[PDB]
Amino acid sequence: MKTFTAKPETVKRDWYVVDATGKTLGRLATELARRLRGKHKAEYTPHVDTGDYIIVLNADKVAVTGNKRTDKVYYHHTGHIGGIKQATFEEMIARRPERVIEIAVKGMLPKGPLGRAMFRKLKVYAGNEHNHAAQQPQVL
Amino acid sequence: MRLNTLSPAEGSKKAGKRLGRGIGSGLGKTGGRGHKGQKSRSGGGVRR
Amino acid sequence: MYAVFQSGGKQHRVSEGQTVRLEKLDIATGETVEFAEVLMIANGEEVKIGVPFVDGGVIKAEVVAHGRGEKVKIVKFRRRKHYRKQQGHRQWFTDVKITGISA
Amino acid sequence: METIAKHRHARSSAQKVRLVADLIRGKKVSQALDILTYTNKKAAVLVKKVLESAIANAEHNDGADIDDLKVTKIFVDEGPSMKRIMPRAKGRADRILKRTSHITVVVSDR
Amino acid sequence: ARVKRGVIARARHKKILKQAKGYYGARSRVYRVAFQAVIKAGQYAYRDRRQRKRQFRQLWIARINAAARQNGISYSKFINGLKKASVEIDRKILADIAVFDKVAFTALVEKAKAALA
Amino acid sequence: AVQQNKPTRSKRGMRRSHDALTAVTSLSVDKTSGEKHLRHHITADGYYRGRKVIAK
RNA sequence: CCCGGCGAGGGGAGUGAAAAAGAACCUGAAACCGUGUACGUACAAGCAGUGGGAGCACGCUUAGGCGUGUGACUGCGUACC
RNA sequence: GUAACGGGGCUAAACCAUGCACCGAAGCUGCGGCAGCGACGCUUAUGCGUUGUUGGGUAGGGGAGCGUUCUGUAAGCCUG
Ligand SMILES: [Mg+2]
Ligand SMILES: [Mg+2]
Ligand SMILES: [Mg+2]
Ligand SMILES: [Mg+2]
Ligand SMILES: [Mg+2]
Ligand SMILES: [Mg+2]
Ligand SMILES: [Mg+2]
Ligand SMILES: [Mg+2]
Ligand SMILES: [Mg+2]
Ligand SMILES: [Mg+2]
């Protein structure tokens, strides 16, 4: 015979504390996404599990685009019709800034089971070095 | 004489060889390969 | 001393191991027989020494061996897409064993 | 074939009897007879009976006592049901299936 | 003069019920649905396998652009240098293999890396 | 009105997922051969605490 | 002979080359219905497979990422006439 | 029901111009195999060794074949 690619079950748990405590938004998302799938790939493969744990600090801070700070909605639509259809802008994101970024970093995933249970390897957090308990022990 | 393990011995008298051109054809009826039925989209023929 | 050798579509990861290939119709027999081989395979592994893709080694770069070099596999498959029907078929594939010595 | 007690037929379909035998299989036997005798529903037809046979056989032509026997396995297969016909409104007529099944129980345990 | 196609008949679809390769219910239980059980299977197959290259090249290519990024690189640059490089011809599929030996393959990057005459 | 296509077996069983069983094997006897339900003994030979009209 | 309602049906015993011939009785296929075991399966979406492929169970194959069963996750993908 | 970029997202991941690099098809090359047409060596009814070319296909035409029942070769051959 010949031979595969080796990505059995792997094991590269991590602690990468991607602060991104500043102006790094938008494009910044790609790295959190790519580093979730395994871009450098010490052995990985787009198909195996393991999001390679990451920790985005602050998050509650992003210059955003050039004006999508006051002008861009998200649009969710609940479910119970009554044509409610929820809409919220960004500057309107004061109750839970953590939500965003996590929202953005999503969709850029394989979409489905693998990429679904791969998102949690982010940890929201909106307030710099706080409750780092998510993995207080080891980091980078 | 040793039995079997010959391969054979000799062939029957009768052995009517290769004409085949003589015959062949025989013609397979239409009504075989998956989608047959063939003919026009009117099957013009039954009407003669 | 690890695989490098090419032919067919290049594929060498085995040292004292064996690897099937095309047919080597030029000559295969039972025992090996004058099997060419080259470091010139763009194989940058070799032994500790790097050995850039295709370094030197003109005349005697390395060699190999030869296993059974027979058998005719299976992967017949079938096929008459919606387009009415026709086809069916079945296809095998002849290969050659070959093991490999002195990388 | 330690005992093997089949009833065959019974006149009670299959799925009807199956439900009465399920939570009443392996081990027990002393319990089974209890389980069955207190579970109201005709399903218990010839089930309590076949066990009586499945235990009688294992008695008359075998060792075993009361402390033994566990009813190793049980199951019910569908059988030659009668096919009658019902009138129904209008000229219509519909076929009625009588339904039947073969009990069969084995207590090859000990 | 006689037919009673029966022993032949049963045999006939049995070949397809044999290759029923445990599908789902009627799919491997019937006869008529067993036939069409081949569209994505048998029908797609003869051609589906040869269509595979992408899945693996997209993989190796990935592995490569992945590793090579040790110095940052650019998958576009790598093969480029390694092309006008030495007699480098066989640089493919070795991707996942390169994963089995950075020390051995990180070196290949050096040769290619010398893009400038 | 009617089913538009045949319910699979994975469906009929998955529909019968409530076969239910009783026989809590609760207190049967307090003074007989193991008989009596969780309340009255063997009528005309049962009793709660003591022989009710008829016993053996 | 035995359980059973002097039932049904059945278990043994016997005849038989056979009862894997018991009278529904030669051979007994398929559809459909179970009992047992193995693997999978209760944050996962669509013609239900095919291509990659982890794990688990068997044989371990009596040495090698091997044959059978099953297939988490993944690229594709709207039956036939 | 976001819903007039596929999505995320982008102030350049948009637009103009230049350049190079890679990816990218069942296209092309490479390796083995098959069948029809011609070539060229062997070699002859010839079949072969290499070889240039061709092989999506409905209606429809042409050409090869597989299997069944029944008849002769069968009082043969296989068979408790
Ligand atoms: Mg997708
Ligand atoms: Mg038809
Ligand atoms: Mg017309
Ligand atoms: Mg028509
Ligand atoms: Mg290609
Ligand atoms: Mg019979
Ligand atoms: Mg689950
Ligand atoms: Mg496969
Ligand atoms: Mg054609
Ligand atoms: Mg045609």
Would you say A95 and A86 are in contact if contact means Cβ atoms under 8 Å apart? no
Mapped to the 3 state alphabet, what secondary structure does B1-48 carry?
CCCCCCCCCCCCCCCCCCCCCCCCCCCCCCCCCCCCCCCCCCCCCCCC
Give E31 to chain C, closest Cα distance, Å: 18
Report chain F residues whose CB lies below 8 A from the CB of E25.
Answer: 8-10
Spatial distance between the Cα atoms of A98 and C12, rounded to a whole number of angstroms: 50
Tokens 């393990």 label which residue?
Answer: B5
**What are the extents of the domains in chain E?**
1-117
Spatial distance between the Cα atoms of D5 and D52, rounded to a whole number of angstroms: 9
CA atoms in the 13 A half-sphere facing the CB of C60: 1
Nucleotide closest in space to D80 (CA vs C1'): G24
Q: What is the DSSP string of A50-88?
A: ----------S----SSSTTTS-------SS-TT-----
CB contact under 8 A, E104 and C41: no
Spatial distance between the Cα atoms of A101 and A79, rounded to a whole number of angstroms: 24
Would you say F48 and F36 are in contact if contact means Cβ atoms under 8 Å apart? no
- Whole-number distance in Å between E23 CA and G22 C1': 41
The reply to whether A43 touches chain E by the CB within 8 Å rule is: yes
Return the CATH number at D59. 3.90.470.10
Instruction: Compare CB distances from E86 to C6, C45, C53 and report the shortest one's residue.
Output: C53
Q: Can you give the resolution of this entry in Å?
A: 9.5
Strand partners, D95: D85
Spatial distance between the Cα atoms of A64 and A92, rounded to a whole number of angstroms: 13
* Closest alpha carbon to C9 in C95, C67, C71, C77: C95
How many Cβ atoms sit within 10 Å of the Cβ of residue D50?
23
Would you say A125 and A131 are in contact if contact means Cβ atoms under 8 Å apart? yes
Nucleotide closest in space to E65 (CA vs C1'): H22
Strand partners, D105: D5, D74
User: Whole-angstrom distance between the N-terminal and C-terminal Cα of chain C?
Assistant: 5
Give the pair of three-digit tokens for residue C62.
């390395």
The helix or strand, by DSSP H or E, that contains position D94, with its residue range, turns out to be: strand D94-97
* Closest alpha carbon to A135 in A49, A51, A10: A51
Spatial distance between the Cα atoms of A8 and A12, rounded to a whole number of angstroms: 12
Spatial distance between the Cα atoms of E36 and E33, rounded to a whole number of angstroms: 5
Would you say A137 and A14 are in contact if contact means Cβ atoms under 8 Å apart? no
Spatial distance between the Cα atoms of E49 and D96, rounded to a whole number of angstroms: 53
The reply to whether C11 touches chain A by the CB within 8 Å rule is: yes
Question: 3-class DSSP state for residue E48?
Answer: helix
CA C83 to centroid of ligand 5, rounded, Å: 25
Would you say D49 and D37 are in contact if contact means Cβ atoms under 8 Å apart? no
Would you say D8 and D103 are in contact if contact means Cβ atoms under 8 Å apart? yes
Spatial distance between the Cα atoms of C80 and C77, rounded to a whole number of angstroms: 11
**What are the extents of the domains in chain C?**
1-103
Give the pair of three-digit tokens for residue F56.
């053996």
Q: Which bases of chain G come closer than 7 Å to a protein CB?
A: 1-4, 7-12, 29-36, 43-45, 47-55, 64-66, 69-77, 79-81
The reply to whether A80 touches chain E by the CB within 8 Å rule is: no
How many Cβ atoms sit within 10 Å of the Cβ of residue C66?
21
* Closest alpha carbon to D45 in D74, D21, D69, D66: D21
Mapped to the 3 state alphabet, what secondary structure does E70-114 carry?
HCCCCHHHHHHHHHHCCCCCCCCCHHHHHCCCHHHHHHHHHHHHC
Number of structural domains found in chain D: 1
Residues 6+ apart with CB under 8 A from C13: A3, C2, C3, E97, E100
* Closest alpha carbon to A123 in A52, A57, A27, A65: A57
Spatial distance between the Cα atoms of C26 and C20, rounded to a whole number of angstroms: 16
Burial class (CB in 10 A: 0-12, 13-18, 19+), E108: buried
Give the pair of three-digit tokens for residue D18.
């199956």
- What does each C-alpha distance from C19 to B12, C12, C14, C94 come to in angstroms? 53, 8, 8, 14
Give the pair of three-digit tokens for residue B15.
């052995």
Give the pair of three-digit tokens for residue E79.
């093969």
D22 → chain F, closest CA residue = F21
User: Whole-angstrom distance between the N-terminal and C-terminal Cα of chain D?
Assistant: 13
The helix or strand, by DSSP H or E, that contains position D106, with its residue range, turns out to be: strand D105-106
Give the pair of three-digit tokens for residue C43.
């194989």
Domain that holds residue D12: 1-110
Strand segments (E) across D46-91: 73-74, 77-78, 83-86
Question: 3-class DSSP state for residue D83?
Answer: strand
Please name the amino acid found at residue C58. Answer: V
Are β-strands D83-86 and D94-97 bridged in parallel, bridged antiparallel, or unpaired? antiparallel
Spatial distance between the Cα atoms of C20 and C68, rounded to a whole number of angstroms: 10
Give D15 to chain F, closest Cα distance, Å: 11
Would you say D79 and D9 are in contact if contact means Cβ atoms under 8 Å apart? yes
Spatial distance between the Cα atoms of A69 and A61, rounded to a whole number of angstroms: 11
> Number of residue pairs across A and C with CB atoms under 8 Å?
5
Q: Is the CB of A109 under 7 A from strand G?
A: no
Would you say A119 and A109 are in contact if contact means Cβ atoms under 8 Å apart? yes
Q: Is the CB of B28 under 7 A from strand H?
A: yes
Spatial distance between the Cα atoms of A81 and A77, rounded to a whole number of angstroms: 8
Give the pair of three-digit tokens for residue D65.
């006592």
